[PDB]
Amino acid sequence: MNPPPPETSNPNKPKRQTNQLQYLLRVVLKTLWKHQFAWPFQQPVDAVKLNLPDYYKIIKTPMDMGTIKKRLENNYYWNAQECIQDFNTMFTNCYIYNKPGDDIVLMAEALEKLFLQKINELPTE
Protein backbone atom coordinates (compact mmCIF):
# COMPACT_ATOMS: atom_id res chain seq x y z
CA MET A 1 0.00 0.00 0.00
CA ASN A 2 0.96 3.64 -0.96
CA PRO A 3 1.51 6.56 1.38
CA PRO A 4 0.39 10.04 0.48
CA PRO A 5 2.91 11.62 -1.95
CA PRO A 6 5.29 14.34 -0.70
CA GLU A 7 3.82 17.83 -0.47
CA THR A 8 4.19 20.09 -3.45
CA SER A 9 3.00 23.24 -1.68
CA ASN A 10 3.09 24.46 1.88
CA PRO A 11 1.57 27.85 2.66
CA ASN A 12 3.59 28.43 5.73
CA LYS A 13 6.88 27.81 3.96
CA PRO A 14 8.30 30.88 2.18
CA LYS A 15 8.74 30.68 -1.58
CA ARG A 16 11.56 31.92 -3.73
CA GLN A 17 12.51 32.12 -7.42
CA THR A 18 16.21 32.33 -8.31
CA ASN A 19 17.98 32.11 -11.65
CA GLN A 20 19.39 28.77 -10.45
CA LEU A 21 15.95 27.38 -9.59
CA GLN A 22 14.58 28.50 -12.96
CA TYR A 23 17.49 26.70 -14.64
CA LEU A 24 16.86 23.58 -12.60
CA LEU A 25 13.37 23.45 -13.98
CA ARG A 26 13.84 24.71 -17.58
CA VAL A 27 17.14 22.99 -18.28
CA VAL A 28 18.05 20.28 -15.80
CA LEU A 29 14.69 18.67 -14.91
CA LYS A 30 13.16 19.17 -18.33
CA THR A 31 16.13 17.60 -20.06
CA LEU A 32 16.42 14.60 -17.68
CA TRP A 33 12.64 14.10 -18.14
CA LYS A 34 13.25 13.29 -21.82
CA HIS A 35 15.89 10.64 -21.20
CA GLN A 36 14.95 7.10 -22.21
CA PHE A 37 15.51 5.95 -18.58
CA ALA A 38 13.48 8.75 -16.92
CA TRP A 39 10.05 7.07 -16.99
CA PRO A 40 10.25 5.19 -13.71
CA PHE A 41 11.17 8.38 -11.87
CA GLN A 42 8.41 10.64 -13.31
CA GLN A 43 5.92 9.80 -10.54
CA PRO A 44 5.98 8.37 -7.00
CA VAL A 45 6.83 4.71 -6.69
CA ASP A 46 3.52 2.85 -7.02
CA ALA A 47 4.29 -0.08 -4.68
CA VAL A 48 0.73 -1.42 -5.25
CA LYS A 49 1.07 -1.58 -9.10
CA LEU A 50 4.64 -2.93 -8.91
CA ASN A 51 3.47 -5.43 -6.45
CA LEU A 52 6.23 -4.30 -4.03
CA PRO A 53 4.44 -3.89 -0.71
CA ASP A 54 7.80 -3.65 1.10
CA TYR A 55 8.96 -0.52 -0.86
CA TYR A 56 7.58 1.98 1.71
CA LYS A 57 8.49 -0.31 4.55
CA ILE A 58 12.10 0.41 3.60
CA ILE A 59 11.99 3.89 1.97
CA LYS A 60 10.85 6.49 4.48
CA THR A 61 11.63 9.69 2.55
CA PRO A 62 10.32 9.08 -0.96
CA MET A 63 10.96 11.43 -3.81
CA ASP A 64 10.47 11.45 -7.57
CA MET A 65 10.90 13.93 -10.45
CA GLY A 66 7.13 14.45 -10.77
CA THR A 67 7.17 15.86 -7.21
CA ILE A 68 10.28 17.89 -7.93
CA LYS A 69 8.79 19.31 -11.13
CA LYS A 70 5.63 20.39 -9.25
CA ARG A 71 7.72 21.95 -6.44
CA LEU A 72 9.78 23.90 -8.97
CA GLU A 73 6.57 25.04 -10.74
CA ASN A 74 5.14 26.10 -7.29
CA ASN A 75 8.33 28.02 -6.35
CA TYR A 76 8.15 25.73 -3.37
CA TYR A 77 11.94 25.75 -2.70
CA TRP A 78 14.02 28.54 -1.13
CA ASN A 79 17.19 27.73 -3.10
CA ALA A 80 18.74 25.36 -5.66
CA GLN A 81 20.48 23.36 -2.98
CA GLU A 82 17.13 22.41 -1.46
CA CYS A 83 16.01 21.11 -4.85
CA ILE A 84 19.29 19.37 -5.58
CA GLN A 85 18.84 17.53 -2.24
CA ASP A 86 15.48 16.13 -3.43
CA PHE A 87 17.22 14.79 -6.60
CA ASN A 88 19.86 13.25 -4.37
CA THR A 89 17.20 11.65 -2.14
CA MET A 90 15.49 10.20 -5.21
CA PHE A 91 18.73 8.60 -6.47
CA THR A 92 19.80 7.40 -3.01
CA ASN A 93 16.38 5.76 -2.41
CA CYS A 94 16.88 3.74 -5.58
CA TYR A 95 20.35 2.52 -4.46
CA ILE A 96 18.96 1.70 -1.01
CA TYR A 97 16.04 -0.45 -2.15
CA ASN A 98 17.86 -2.17 -5.01
CA LYS A 99 21.31 -3.73 -5.64
CA PRO A 100 24.22 -2.89 -7.96
CA GLY A 101 23.55 -4.15 -11.53
CA ASP A 102 19.71 -4.08 -11.26
CA ASP A 103 17.96 -2.57 -14.26
CA ILE A 104 16.40 0.24 -12.18
CA VAL A 105 19.87 0.97 -10.68
CA LEU A 106 21.50 1.22 -14.09
CA MET A 107 18.76 3.72 -14.97
CA ALA A 108 19.30 5.78 -11.77
CA GLU A 109 23.12 5.74 -12.29
CA ALA A 110 22.73 7.05 -15.86
CA LEU A 111 20.35 9.82 -14.82
CA GLU A 112 22.51 10.77 -11.85
CA LYS A 113 25.54 11.16 -14.12
CA LEU A 114 23.58 13.39 -16.48
CA PHE A 115 22.14 15.30 -13.47
CA LEU A 116 25.65 16.01 -12.13
CA GLN A 117 26.90 17.07 -15.54
CA LYS A 118 24.06 19.59 -15.75
CA ILE A 119 24.34 21.11 -12.24
CA ASN A 120 28.16 21.31 -12.39
CA GLU A 121 27.73 24.82 -13.59
CA LEU A 122 24.62 26.82 -12.66
CA PRO A 123 23.63 30.40 -13.54
CA THR A 124 24.75 33.33 -11.37
CA GLU A 125 22.17 35.25 -9.25
Ligand X SMILES: Cc1cc(CSc2nnc3ccccn23)on1
Does residue 89 belong to the site contacting ligand X (CB under 6 A)? no
Could you tell me which stretch among 28-36, 79-87, 92-100, 115-123 binds ligand X (CB under 6 A)? 92-100
Site for ligand X (CB under 6 A): which residue of 20, 94, 111, 112? 94
Separation of alpha carbons 125 and 41, rounded Å: 29
- Collect all residues with Cβ–Cβ distance below 8 Å to 55 and sequence separation of at least 6: 45, 47, 97
Does residue 50 belong to the site contacting ligand X (CB under 6 A)? yes
Separation of alpha carbons 41 and 68, rounded Å: 10
Is 22 exposed, middle or buried, given 0-12, 13-18 or 19+ CB atoms closer than 10 A?
A: middle
Question: Residue 21 or 59: which CB sits closer to ligand X?
Answer: 59
Question: Residue 8 or 98: which CB sits closer to ligand X?
Answer: 98
Positions in the binding site for ligand X (CB under 6 A): 40-41, 45, 50, 52, 94, 97-98, 103-104
